[PDB]
Write a protein that binds this ligand. Sequence first.
Ligand SMILES: Cc1cc2nc3c(=O)[nH]c(=O)nc-3n(C[C@H](O)[C@H](O)[C@H](O)COP(=O)(O)OP(=O)(O)OC[C@H]3O[C@@H](n4cnc5c(N)ncnc54)[C@H](O)[C@@H]3O)c2cc1C
Ligand SMILES: O=C(c1ccc(OCCN2CCCCC2)cc1)c1c(-c2ccc(O)cc2)sc2cc(O)ccc12
Ligand SMILES: O=C(c1ccc(OCCN2CCCCC2)cc1)c1c(-c2ccc(O)cc2)sc2cc(O)ccc12
Ligand SMILES: Nc1nc2c(c(=O)[nH]1)N[C@H]1C(S)=C(S)[C@@H](COP(=O)(O)O)O[C@H]1N2
Ligand SMILES: Nc1nc2c(c(=O)[nH]1)N[C@H]1C(S)=C(S)[C@@H](COP(=O)(O)O)O[C@H]1N2
Ligand code: MOS
Ligand code: MOS
Ligand code: FES
Ligand code: FES
Lengths: 1295, 99, 50, 50
Amino acid sequence: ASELLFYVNGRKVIEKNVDPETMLLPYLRKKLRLTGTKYGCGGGGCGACTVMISRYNPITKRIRHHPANACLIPICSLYGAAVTTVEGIGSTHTRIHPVQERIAKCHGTQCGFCTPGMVMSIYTLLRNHPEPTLDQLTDALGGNLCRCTGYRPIIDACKTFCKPKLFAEEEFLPLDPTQELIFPPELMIMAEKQSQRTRVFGSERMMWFSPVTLKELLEFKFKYPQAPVIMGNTSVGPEVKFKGVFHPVIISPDRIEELSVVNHAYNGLTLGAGLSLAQVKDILADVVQKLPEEKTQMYHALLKHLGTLAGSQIRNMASLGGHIISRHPDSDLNPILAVGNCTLNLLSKEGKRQIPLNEQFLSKCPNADLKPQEILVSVNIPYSRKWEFVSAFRQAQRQENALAIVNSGMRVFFGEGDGIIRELCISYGGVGPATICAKNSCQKLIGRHWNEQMLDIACRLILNEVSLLGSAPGGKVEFKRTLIISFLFKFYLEVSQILKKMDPVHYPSLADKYESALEDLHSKHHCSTLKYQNQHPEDPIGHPIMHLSGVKHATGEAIYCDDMPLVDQELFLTFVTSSRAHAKIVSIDLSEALSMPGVVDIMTAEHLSDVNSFCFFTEAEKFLATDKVFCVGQLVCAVLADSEVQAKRAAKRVKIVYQDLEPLILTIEESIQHNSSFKPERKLEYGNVDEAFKVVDQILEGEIHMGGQEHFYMETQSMLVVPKGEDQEMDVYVSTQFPKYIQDIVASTLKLPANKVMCHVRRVGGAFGGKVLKTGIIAAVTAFAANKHGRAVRCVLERGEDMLITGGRHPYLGKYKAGFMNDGRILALDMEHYSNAGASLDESLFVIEMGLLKMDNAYKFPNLRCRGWACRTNLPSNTAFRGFGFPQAALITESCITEVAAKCGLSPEKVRIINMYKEIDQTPYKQEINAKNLIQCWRECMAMSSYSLRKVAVEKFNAENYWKKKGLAMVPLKFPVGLGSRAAGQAAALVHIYLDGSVLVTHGGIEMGQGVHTKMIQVVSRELRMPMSNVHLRGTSTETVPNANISGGSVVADLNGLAVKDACQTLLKRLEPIISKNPKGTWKDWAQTAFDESINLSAVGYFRGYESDMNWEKGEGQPFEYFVYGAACSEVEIDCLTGDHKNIRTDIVMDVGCSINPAIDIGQIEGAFIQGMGLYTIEELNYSPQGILHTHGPDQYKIPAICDMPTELHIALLPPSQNSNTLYSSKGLGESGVFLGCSVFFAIHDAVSAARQERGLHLTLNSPLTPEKIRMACEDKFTKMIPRDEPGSYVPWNV
Amino acid sequence: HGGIEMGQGVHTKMIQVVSRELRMPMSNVHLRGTSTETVPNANISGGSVVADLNGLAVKDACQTLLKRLEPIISKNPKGTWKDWAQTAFDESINLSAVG
Amino acid sequence: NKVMCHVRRVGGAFGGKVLKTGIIAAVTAFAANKHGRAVRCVLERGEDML
Amino acid sequence: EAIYCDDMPLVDQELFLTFVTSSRAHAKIVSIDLSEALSMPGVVDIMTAE
Ligand SMILES: Cc1cc2nc3c(=O)[nH]c(=O)nc-3n(C[C@H](O)[C@H](O)[C@H](O)COP(=O)(O)OP(=O)(O)OC[C@H]3O[C@@H](n4cnc5c(N)ncnc54)[C@H](O)[C@@H]3O)c2cc1C
Ligand SMILES: O=C(c1ccc(OCCN2CCCCC2)cc1)c1c(-c2ccc(O)cc2)sc2cc(O)ccc12
Ligand SMILES: O=C(c1ccc(OCCN2CCCCC2)cc1)c1c(-c2ccc(O)cc2)sc2cc(O)ccc12
Ligand SMILES: Nc1nc2c(c(=O)[nH]1)N[C@H]1C(S)=C(S)[C@@H](COP(=O)(O)O)O[C@H]1N2
Ligand SMILES: Nc1nc2c(c(=O)[nH]1)N[C@H]1C(S)=C(S)[C@@H](COP(=O)(O)O)O[C@H]1N2
Ligand code: MOS
Ligand code: MOS
Ligand code: FES
Ligand code: FES
């Protein structure tokens, strides 16, 4: 009946009869009402829930601070400890901590959802290293993810703690050592008492025991043999959350000294099972410094793989003993330990026992495993002998914080006087259910020498022993087979080199071209430069004004939808989704779930009666599935319960029986094959392509595939629906891009006029087009439940169900036939576009239309035919995305240009200049354009980036390196901006002036992090001639501005700015006579005089929209208002033996017109570029042949992290030009920079061609260009040597 | 509007005004309340003139909207307010007015 | 522009819900801001008449 | 079903404010003693003019 006592932000927290299942993250937000700490993914991978844990050790008299992810911490493990959140280090009503002030003022926030995690990771680092290096700060952020900023401004804020810019660094608060938080004195007293008592907590579902003595821990291990021993909960935690595991009894000890031991012996090193991985990293890093290389072989290999293991938070939570026992097949440490003669020190009531850490232990043979009543105390890792060498290798989707596809540990021992292999141990991870060893191959290699024929024999032996079925889980089978022998080759080169160093007489030397295979791709030197431009001083237009919510982002005070306080008696709604891609729902059983605790209601399609459908565009479609399902993740049931936990528990016991249906369509080609119904065609024609193909020198046929993309907004789908209690009024608070649409679908579902339903949006934590259609579906179903039961209803999706429900960017297939001259002119181009639409074709026709109107990019194709189709599949329906078809259509065009370049013997850059638009030219849709800035962006990027010089240096590197290659590429940009009609571009605003002079402004646009609200206050400040501090904005609401269009299409700030300007001018006109009589007066004087003279101080602003038109039958029109121009150059280096690659440098020039806010505009270029970079390289969605999205292990989705950012990044804004049509001659940058990411794609493509051309192979690389695709294209003796399975003889993991 | 409902039925009288001026049944109109966030600088609800003066402001906003919509009303006199409102949107005519 | 007042309906006033109402609101708002909490104030009939 | 001001639902963690009023028609406030009231259950704050 113990009490749980710990501290949060200096305040004491006591809980009586605490539920042991309580986790820290929901406890902070709901019970303590501290909503700064966010939910991001719930698996410990994104860092949005980063907090600081502080403990006091009474034996050593020292206070330790360590970061942690609150989503994995059970609060029962916090007894006597101190938590610190973002709110605990500062706020706007106390003091702003320097970390908060700088990340905000350096423009390190956009949507702000990731900021509290970034702050806590930086703050915790500074509490441990007050005078740090940049490497220490970037390592601390390795497990912190951002979708908006591109990480550059956050590194800038990190740099200021180390020793024409966008921030005044000299005005920052210095780091005050007297202001830092004090460890709660009471916790120090409790630790001094050194209690021996075992703490006990419990509920009806779980028993929790926390022994504090070794004797008690052994007693509970004996009485509850099957109970897990929780340390950091980073293996058990994710398994109970995502795999339905449940433990009725938990043993979680508290700082047992015997498990924290660190013994420096004569023969080796003994590390306790309770040490965290971060502590082991530090212990080993100290040992390798004070001991000679001869003995520290095992410790260097372990240090290598501890550097890339997850992030700083997980490393500070996870234990060494937990790592060994959990026996993950993808473990990075267990393959190294398996080859190092390590032994495990076990303990129980019976006594002590020592077992080897071998292959049988890692395979969980009960003969070589722990006994049920045994614990692991410590592990012994021996010193290495002379002539003993150990190496570790790994390859994953991303350099850091990603589970390995294959890893390995290898050890070899030579005889002093023979050079003969005496011992050899090789183990691999990620190639089976457990870590395996090649004990048979190794034993056969015993007695040989280290030379060519040993390596060739070893390869064939290894491949036979460590075999993989073509159906092996995780997929990437041919990649895994190649990596297995590629690592062996690297180990061969490593050992061959040190032997030649130690024994020059008996060994040959490495070939010069082979030596860089030993150097890994690594860099932490993140450099960058920015270039922009330079009216009264009061006028903020053109100034780098910080995001209005920047500081509130950094303090956790920004309210997102789920941060809203608990509404009285609100319920929670969760969905049961489809587990089949195309099947018949034969029956649904709700009997069990309905009877479960807290369940209020469960709704199927028949409970929604006639409001289960809604006409979004051309046809009415279901909210909930009826008799059939047409993709996984389709909504089927909606569970309504008193609490979120009760809702998810009941939803799991809803029972649905399926009967699969043919056909099962998953790919575009399957969709074309199985389709025979009429499909609406979209077509562009310019010139005469049939005539032109008879004059060209050459003809070329090619095709490229391009995968999709998850939005990965850091804030998942979130909404709160509150009925008023009168006249069926409904208030809908939802994270959406389109409040008008939420209002329509909610009112329709409730059979109400629109004046009864209002939608309010203050801010959105990222959207990128993925918070529109299905957001309304969920909002309509949630509102139906709220009205039915007269209760507020909240609905927030977890990351997993969010990715299954929402859908992502349209995958593409592009087929082209190109007729070109021998010098590069493409006189004829016959192009075909196919989009994978998913189960619904709602927004797939619009992206096809935009793809055709944008596929020309920067090139004048005199004879061009372009056609496009949207293809239905049995996959989640795909939505809009940043770019709106341009990132797909332009890559397909750039792929065709790259293929034409190969035929002509010219670099792709030369073919680009010869096909580029002229200064005055014409588009395929017969719109006249001015491309002066297109050419200028190209020239300035060539000069700024020193392309020609670096081109020679890359060719020189590739001529001197065989297993490493560098690549270089530059692509141009023409991103046109414009909607389909004038009505689609209209915007409105509402401005009040109160009698004290202050101003309230609101408009129809939505803040997603792009800073539209900041830009509107900048407009009000100029038009009304008042400082921005006199203006304020609350949010966006259908109750104040009606009939607002979707926040999207790169025009949000442009059009709403014109509406805000319109209202400000109306007010200034009314006040001109009062202005004249008192020119020296304040706005308080002018407002009061206006009231006294009966002059209205409220005005509606309105803009009718740009004139835009497109006649799709004729294929002509004036659809676009202006064009964003740009150029991007990127350089990379690839590892031909593994597929790894490093982004070395990127240079970007952008035509932005006159930037209203260069800080925000540059931040939009950086974020778009990084988002496109992930689209073309590392972001990959894996589906099974049954249509199931794979999300565990190496199938986890990876967005770019800090390690993926280019080490060098130069961005320059083109000098301004006049554009009297747009607001202040500005241009909308939001979507343009995404395509610039493919400069990395074609830089990798360049490097792959260099290796292929040198190896004599005479290339279509699909997107995303993953390490799997890079490695397999670099064909060598290993690619040819691997076994291959007959296609169709096995069911693959992926398609 | 700026007036306060304290039992005298001002809100009832305002929707009566909207019903006349816009030629629509009162069930097509709705009012939620009074807020400084929607109507600023409103005088006290007192002096026997609350319905008088706010009625003239509501009448002013209705006439501004009916002015904007007269060309659309002319071409489709038999249409509903749903038809007229959507056509106004399609022709980029503002449907919010301050009285 | 930082302070908004919302009124749906009043259960009778007859002039007696102006000046003193603002004083009570100003004092209540001071407490609410001082403690970061929402604050409710309702008067009983006796103290109301005083 | 008509919502008057006090009919609004309990908002999360809201407090309540009540007033101590004068019992004299014309006098001077010699002293105010809050020691007992401040220590009583639930009391968050007591505010005087200063
Ligand atoms: C986001 C994320 C990223 C990751 N990335 C990587 C990665 O890149 N590479 C990698 O190799 N791993 C990775 N991991 C896995 C991680 O290294 C392990 O989950 C961790 O080391 C397990 O230690 P723990 O203390 O969290 O164990 P727990 O989850 O607390 O326990 C796991 C198991 O160990 C048992 N156990 C623990 N201590 C003892 C003991 N003394 N005696 C007996 N049994 C014991 C428990 O009973 C339980 O069965 C990642 C995990 C996460 C969540
Ligand atoms: O016994 C040898 C050895 C034997 C013959 C060698 O000949 C080198 C090639 N030779 C050059 C002169 C003309 C004939 C060919 C070299 C090393 C040892 C080694 C070796 C290395 C590579 C290889 O492919 C085979 C063996 S390594 C070694 C270590 C020792 O302590 C003792 C002997 C050795
Ligand atoms: O902007 C639209 C939209 C606009 C007009 C439409 O017209 C449909 C035809 N209908 C005819 C009768 C009058 C009303 C319109 C459809 C969608 C988008 C949507 C919408 C808006 C309102 C609504 O009630 C339902 C759906 S959903 C959507 C997703 C996008 O990615 C882009 C635009 C959109
Ligand atoms: N931080 C952030 N930036 C963003 C987005 C977002 O969700 N978050 N959305 C992008 C998309 S899809 C569009 S269309 C534009 C919309 O705003 P704008 O028109 O003012 O650029 O912002 C872009 N930039
Ligand atoms: N039911 C009701 N009627 C009422 C009042 C009231 O509080 N309740 N106030 C009176 C007062 S003080 C005035 S000044 C007027 C204000 O509204 P009117 O201007 O529309 O008459 O309503 C009068 N009638
Ligand atoms: O245009 Mo951005 O909303 S897909
Ligand atoms: O005129 Mo009534 O507000 S006293
Ligand atoms: S790391 Fe916990 S929510 Fe992402
Ligand atoms: S600011 Fe980092 S996720 Fe948006």
